[PDB]
Design a protein around this ligand. Structure first.
Ligand SMILES: CNC(=O)Cn1c(=O)nc(Nc2ccc(OC(F)F)cc2C)n(Cc2cc(F)c(F)c(F)c2)c1=O
Ligand SMILES: CNC(=O)Cn1c(=O)nc(Nc2ccc(OC(F)F)cc2C)n(Cc2cc(F)c(F)c(F)c2)c1=O
Lengths: 298, 301
């Protein structure tokens, strides 16, 4: 019993984390086979951070301007792919796990290994929000910390951290260096956009609560279109049939149909929680996917 | 910035996790140097698990009755012994991946990371607090017995919890690494249940400081208080007493924020007396007590 926000075990990723130094700029890098992946912001200096020309900044450096440590790696090739740098090194990481690069979709979750100076400090779970931010915990030096999921022995890397926006949320890229959302790697004013709640995830969590003995919030039914109207009023993402489909195995296990759980959610939205808690939380929680629930509950 | 329940990176502990099997009973063990540590419950068969005679079950065993598997590697057991509620299995191989480590027995209020494991295979990591009633609010299914809790300091792992059982309210009870249970619980079926719990007061104040450092300020009021007057309020709200030692522990956060500990106490006082009025603090609608002052410093420095 019990339900908690749980990260994947970080050992496979820990052995991949390096420090990347270019002149007087340092951050975190990801060493896999004979290649170190890191954010291209590593080539800027204090002066450059406001509107850097990365192409032009990069030309002013060769293979030997980049210091990789985790020991020492000798850099023998460099290239910029989108917003990340690929540094070919002479040594294949003997600690390289089976891995894949994947671009996740909004509302999916992953584990973050928060790192500083190439050294792992902590691990936590979070969601790619609908507005393509994450609500992490990062301080200066955490650039290049990565997010991932694990499938038995394979690590799917989906996120590399770049920056904190003025609002205190975080943005970054896939491991091919394309930002999630409309963000750019420069210190300018950047609007995140409306942060909507991941409806399918909130429903999953309500299933998790029923599996764990929290049932006071059950009852009425509703309709998709009727529920979706309430969704928009409360800045919840619209609920589609594919979402109803993804929730099938939890519905099946609990004997609670999706639309009955929606009608339960309507009352919570329209009426609040009347001072009660669900899985020890006094608000609706949207960072567990249906898969997350199933995994933890079996 | 931002604030999250954050576990320690688990790799150092992952490499110590093994599977221990005795007949058809299996669970997790911890392999450090040439010793494997696990719950003694593993020597029970189904028919013994209700009211076991551990001394009796143990004497009937030899080394070869214990199968220890570290991933694919079959270890060979060359000694066995029982210490309180754990078993200690001497094996012929020292664990090449043994971190620098210590065993520590923690106080109520302190937090640790749990690596939840099944069949000696790690499945997830999350943070927990030892509750004042000596349970933890974890996430554990059957087969998690022997999973460990720990803290890490530089390269040194401090092991503080080995998981044994789930109580009927769905909370969790276990031992330190010398095998002595936290709280009054026993490794057998009895009428045992979790006491009434209280809130870890010094942790709430640390988390309020954390909120301040992240830009939450609405709860900061014009009042101050005394330690005496504050403790009267705490008692009413089933909060643990705040001691002058606690005040001293909170010194650093006070120095970083420039809010005197007694001024923060008066803020908490108002929060307890009037509730939060539907506002949030660090994305929470309740007062959180599972961050230590250490946890806060770690994450806001
Ligand atoms: C709260 N902070 C964060 O979430 C992450 N973050 C960070 O870690 N570092 C930043 N700038 C910086 C400063 C110094 C430095 O090296 C020096 F110590 F030698 C190296 C770097 C990368 N930034 C700001 C940032 C702004 C951007 F526009 C970016 F594109 C970017 F990658 C980072 C962080 O946000
Ligand atoms: C929700 N469950 C838990 O948190 C932990 N838990 C557990 O993982 N296993 C249990 N019993 C069991 C069953 C079969 C078995 O071998 C077989 F699987 F091959 C091995 C074991 C240990 N128990 C019950 C328990 C009761 C006690 F009195 C204990 F002392 C104890 F250590 C475990 C769990 O609670």
């Amino acid at each position: 019993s019990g339900f908690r926000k749980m990260a994947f075990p970080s050992g496979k990723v820990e052995g991949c984390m390096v420090q990347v130094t270019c002149g007087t700029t340092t951050l975190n890098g990801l060493w896999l086979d004979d290649v170190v992946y890191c954010p291209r912001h590593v080539i800027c200096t204090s002066e450059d951070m406001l509107n850097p020309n990365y192409e032009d900044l990069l030309i002013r450096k060769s293979n030997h301007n980049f210091l990789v440590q985790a020991v020492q790696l000798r850099v023998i090739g460099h290239s910029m792919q989108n917003c990340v740098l690929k540094l070919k090194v002479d040594t294949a990481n003997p600690k390289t796990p089976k891995y894949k690069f994947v671009r996740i979709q909004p509302g999916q979750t992953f584990s973050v290994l928060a790192c500083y100076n190439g050294s792992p400090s902590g691990v936590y779970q979070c969601a790619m929000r609908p507005n393509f931010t994450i609500k992490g915990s990062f301080l200066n030096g955490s650039c290049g910390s990565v997010g991932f999921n694990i499938d038995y022995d394979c690590v799917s890397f989906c996120y590399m951290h770049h920056m904190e926006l003025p609002t205190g949320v975080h943005a970054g890229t896939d491991l091919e260096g394309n930002f999630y959302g409309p963000f750019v790697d420069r210190q300018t004013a950047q609007a995140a956009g409306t942060d909507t709640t991941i409806t399918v995830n909130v429903l999953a969590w309500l299933y998790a609560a029923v599996i764990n003995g929290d049932r006071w919030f059950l009852n009425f039914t509703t309709t998709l279109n009727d529920f979706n109207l309430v969704a928009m009023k409360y800045n919840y993402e619209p609920l589609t049939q594919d979402h109803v489909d993804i929730l099938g195995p939890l519905s099946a296990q609990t004997g609670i149909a999706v639309l009955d759980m929606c009608a339960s959610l309507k009352e919570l939205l329209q009426n609040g929680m009347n001072g009660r808690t669900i899985l020890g939380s006094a608000l609706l929680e949207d960072e567990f996917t249906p898969f997350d629930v199933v995994r933890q509950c079996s």
